[PDB]
């Protein structure tokens, strides 16, 4: 039974069947000083207390978090629901349809491979900024999705009707954070006569933007997320909670942007990695949801699990605003405020004890940006033209790109057009308000187009060269924008709504007028894309920019303007208006009562009603695709993008106890913070590339190709591409080259092809890397690759959260030096055969032995950190488990 029942009541006397667990009712005190993301894993355990995957301990154990903290201990957590968007979202249906296929053949019912909690996909990942600058953009944007993208489009809505409890957000609705602040998001579920906090994982490191809504919520691997679906608890140690104080007020010109910016760099300086950031200070109750859940989204580019704010009456006003219906309003509040999970942020008796408390002063936040290379290298606007001036002659690296003095003045003509224009090392070739991160804050988008309206009012205008874009994460807000008027003016500088979707935030920033590429690359110069998104790694926004810089949306359509970063806003003009002279960007710039006027006039409940009134059926391409009424999957052998997976082929009923590797050949050695792009490209697949020749032999055109991220269906395509990444330094070559050395033979190959020789004779491989490694996106295809290619461990300095979880999920061991120990002070080369001894019993994070050719050894910490990870271990991955645990 259920041990907790008798803390169930009735939250209302008058709706006497809707329950709720009164956590209160524990009576204990230890509850009240709890860290409010620790009291909702405490609701999942309680509700879900059955005393064989939940048992009384695990309970006892949270309610301790003050002192079990420290004492690395093991709690399931079972959350409510989970979001996919595409691109994790076609792997993870392809591994349910072969579930269900390896359950049938051991004598299973295929059945039991369902949803068994609510999940939600939006499909968000697949247009692309093929043009701009047009009306008919969008249209034009959203016809050639569709056409590159149809089958996995078919596949998809296919699994939405082969599967329980799977509802799809078709294309040209908006992005998956976004939709899900403003739509999807719950809040407090009620559910068979019980009330709960809304809580998830979702398939997307971003995933923690909900946190800014205060649903406990972050990012997993795709395998998790189909193990949580089946039922199957996350196993987590329990974490460490810093408190964020915000103090003070933010000086009326900055934007939620430079906050969170702001707030990167300091906790990357502090090191959250492994750690639950809850905020809270006078200082949040200030700060609208929007802005929240921009400082939330960020929350894997400074490396903490979650960043939580509570639930306040900001909040539910944000519910309010954004129509969720008033029957569910009464409730939601008036449960939050009885279990205790309802915040006061302006009451300092109610602050939980957390581990430690890091401050920030909210007022010496200034307007910034970051880049040219890092989302953590926030350089203040005002010193723009200056740093970098600076990185031009600096040493190559995250702050120089070692242009030689002489040629800091580089430039190139070019005919656009039909008229002549210059292009410099500075000029901004990319302009994109993108990013849930910043499209879903009405204060920044708003903000852009007030902007806007007095930049075209002064006379001035974007060259018309310039890759601008909006690209919003929902129809809500091009609504606000035309209802506002300001529409027609951000329609002038080039910024026509080109889609809803991801694109150049992911990447999918579409072509350059060639033109301009031809002035780049003749040149020599660095050109620069400025970007409202969260991400601006040297390979991720466009080929052909070398410097990449993140920056609120008004602060992109400044930029674009003055057409270069090389300015200095302050002394000079962004143009002349003929009339009244100079103007500067302080002239244009509205202030925060400006925008927050607007806001509340335009921003209403109506909207929000009328834009997701129709979002599952409005989609008549969608609507129209025929799928077949199959429940088991029709695995077509002609098709490039769906194919049934390697995994679970000669799957058996009984375990096999593990065996020692023996002899392996190190396949690559890496430095530090090689991110899963690097292991996994999402990208452009490259035409001297084993990918590009397994497409080739199936007639298709480079044109063809589509992105690595489309072909996630297909293994044999992504396991070509591991490693793939043209930046990918292997200390092998020393040299930017997805490639290594066969060692046996002494022969350079590309990497998906040394493996192969290796595999064919029989020889297990690792991978030796440095610190941070498998840093930023969630791809769950950076464990899945390296296993197909025979990867058997890794041994890095250290691993960040989702990777790491990933690779215990596809039965490759995570190991991790000794504190203080590394590939230099152990003496490491990378060309000695590695034996890794795997001990008869098992515990989580032992040290094994490992044996070199050399004679040499050393220890490894085997990072299993919880009992159950080490049982996945034991089964050859989770998946396998979980596929035995449904059979029998
Ligand atoms: S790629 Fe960018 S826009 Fe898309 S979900 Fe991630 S953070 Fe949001
Ligand atoms: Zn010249």
């Not at 906790?267 to 949040?284: A, Y």
């Not at 921009?294 to 929350?299: D, F, L, R, S």
């Not at 491989?765 to 295809?781: F, H, M, N, P, T």
């Not at 203080?820 to 989580?844: C, F, M, V, W």
């Amino acid at each position: 039974s259920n041990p907790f029942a008798h803390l169930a009541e009735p939250l209302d006397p008058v709706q006497p069947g809707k329950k709720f667990f009164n956590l209160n009712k524990l009576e204990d005190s230890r509850y009240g000083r709890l860290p409010f993301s620790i009291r909702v894993l405490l609701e999942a355990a309680i509700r879900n207390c059955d005393e064989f995957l939940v048992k009384k301990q695990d309970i006892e154990n949270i309610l301790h978090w003050n002192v079990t903290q420290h004492k690395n201990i093991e709690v399931p957590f079972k959350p409510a629901r989970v979001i996919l968007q595409d691109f994790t979202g076609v792997p993870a249906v392809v591994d349910f349809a072969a579930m269900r296929d390896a359950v049938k053949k051991l004598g299973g019912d295929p059945e039991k491979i369902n949803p068994v909690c609510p999940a939600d996909l939006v499909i968000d990942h697949s247009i692309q900024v093929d043009f701009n600058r047009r009306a008919d953009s969008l249209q034009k944007n959203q016809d050639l999705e569709f056409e590159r993208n149809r089958e996995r489009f078919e596949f998809l809505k296919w699994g939405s009707q082969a599967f329980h409890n799977m509802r799809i957000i078709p294309p040209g609705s908006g992005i998956i954070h976004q939709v899900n602040l403003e739509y999807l998001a719950r809040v407090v579920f009620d559910q068979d006569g019980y009330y709960y906090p809304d809580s998830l994982v979702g398939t997307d490191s971003h995933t923690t933007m909900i946190d800014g809504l205060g649903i406990l919520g972050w990012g997993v691997g795709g395998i998790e997320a189909e193990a949580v679906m089946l039922g199957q608890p996350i196993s987590m140690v329990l974490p460490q909670v810093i408190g964020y104080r915000l103090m003070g007020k933010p000086h009326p010109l900055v934007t939620s942007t430079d906050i969170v910016l702001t707030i990167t760099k300091h906790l990357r300086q502090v090191g959250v990695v492994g750690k639950f950031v809850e905020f809270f200070g006078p200082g949040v109750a200030q700060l609208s949801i929007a802005d929240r859940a921009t400082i939330a989204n960020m929350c894997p580019e400074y490396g903490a699990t979650a960043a939580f704010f509570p639930v306040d009456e900001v909040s539910i006003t944000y519910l309010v605003q954004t129509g969720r219906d008033e029957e569910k309003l009464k409730y939601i509040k008036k449960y939050l405020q009885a279990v205790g999970m309802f915040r006061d942020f302006n009451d300092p008796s109610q602050d939980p004890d957390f581990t430690q408390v890091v401050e920030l002063d909210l007022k010496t936040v200034v307007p910034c940006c970051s880049g040219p290379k890092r989302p953590q290298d926030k350089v203040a606007v005002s010193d723009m033209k200056k740093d970098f001036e600076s990185c031009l002659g600096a040493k190559q690296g995250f702050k120089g790109f070692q242009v030689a003095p002489e040629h800091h003045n580089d430039h190139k003509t070019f005919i656009y057009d039909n008229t002549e224009f210059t292009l410099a090392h500075g000029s901004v070739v990319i302009a994109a308000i993108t990013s849930c991160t910043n499209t879903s804050n009405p204060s920044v988008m708003l903000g852009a187009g007030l902007l806007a309206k007095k930049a075209v009012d002064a006379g001035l205008n974007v060259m018309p060269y310039i890759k601008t874009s909006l690209s919003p994460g929902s129809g809500v807000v091009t609504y606000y924008l035309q209802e506002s008027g300001v529409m027609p003016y951000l329609s002038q500088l080039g910024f026509d709504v080109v889609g809803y979707g991801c694109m150049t935030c992911i990447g999918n920033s579409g072509p350059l007028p060639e033109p301009v590429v031809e002035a780049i690359t003749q040149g020599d110069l660095v050109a620069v894309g400025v970007l409202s998104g969260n991400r601006n790694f040297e390979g991720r926004v466009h080929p052909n920019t070398r410097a990449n810089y993140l920056a609120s949306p008004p602060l992109v359509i400044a930029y674009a303007i003055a057409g270069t970063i090389r300015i200095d806003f302050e002394k000079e003009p962004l143009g002349v208006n003929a009339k009244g002279q100079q103007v500067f960007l302080k002239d244009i710039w509205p202030t925060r009562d400006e925008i927050q006027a607007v806001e509340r006039q335009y921003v209403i409940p109506g909207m929000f009603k009328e834009v997701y009134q129709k979002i599952e059926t409005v989609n008549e391409s969608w609507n129209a695709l025929a799928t077949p009424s199959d429940k088991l999957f029709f695995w077509n052998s002609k098709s490039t993008y769906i194919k049934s997976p390697p995994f679970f082929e000669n799957l058996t009923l009984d375990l096999q106890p593990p065996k020692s590797i023996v002899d392996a050949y190190v396949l690559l050695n890496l430095g530090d913070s090689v991110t899963t792009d690097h292991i996994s490209p999402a990208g452009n697949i490259a035409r001297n590339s084993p990918a590009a020749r397994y497409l080739t032999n199936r007639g298709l055109t480079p044109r063809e190709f589509n992105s690595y991220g489309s072909r996630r269906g297909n293994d044999a395509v992504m396991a070509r591409g591991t490693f793939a990444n043209i930046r990918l330094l292997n200390r092998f070559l020393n040299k930017q080259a997805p490639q290594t050395i066969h060692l046996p033979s002494g022969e350079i190959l590309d990497v998906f092809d040394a493996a192969e020789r290796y595999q064919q004779a029989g020889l297990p491989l690792i991978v030796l890397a440095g610190k941070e490694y498998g840093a930023g996106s969630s791809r769950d295809w950076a464990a899945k690759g390296p296993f197909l290619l025979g990867i058997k461990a890794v041994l890095a300095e250290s691993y960040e959260r989702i990777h790491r979880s990933n690779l215990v999920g596809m039965g490759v061991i995570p190991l991790e030096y000794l504190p203080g120990e590394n590939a230099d002070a152990l003496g490491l080369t990378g060309q000695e055969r590695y034996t890794i001894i795997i001990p008869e019993n098992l515990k989580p994070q032992m040290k094994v032995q490992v044996k070199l050719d050399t004679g040499k050894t050393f220890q490894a910490v085997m990072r299993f950190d919880t009992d159950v990870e080490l049982t996945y271990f034991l089964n050859g991955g989770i998946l396998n488990y979980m596929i035995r645990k449904m059979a029998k």
